[PDB]
Assembly symmetry: C2
Homo-oligomer: 51 residues x 2
């Protein structure tokens, strides 16, 4: 915020990115979510065999 100026939302948002980039832990488990791009490519491969 400058003296007579205003505050852009493109700077209020990169500040909020700095708050939510410290919400991640400094060392974390890479707990994998199965994406739907590969959870359907293995579901229908079982459905093409008939499971």
């Amino acid at each position: 915020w400058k003296k007579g100026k205003t505050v852009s939302i493109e700077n209020l948002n990169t500040v909020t990115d700095k708050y939510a980039a410290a919400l991640v832990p400094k060392r974390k488990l890479a707990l994998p979510v199965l994406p739907e791009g590969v959870k359907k490519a293995v579901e229908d491969f079982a459905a093409s065999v008939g499971q």
Copy 2:
């Protein structure tokens, strides 16, 4: 094979299809091969996590 005619290879091959369609069993286990279309979509999903 007709009397004075010849034998086409498009009829010698559909005869060979009838020999190799009785090589399949009348009741079979649907033993699934994993295709490379889904064995790579689950390999790199483990390689994007770093396994």
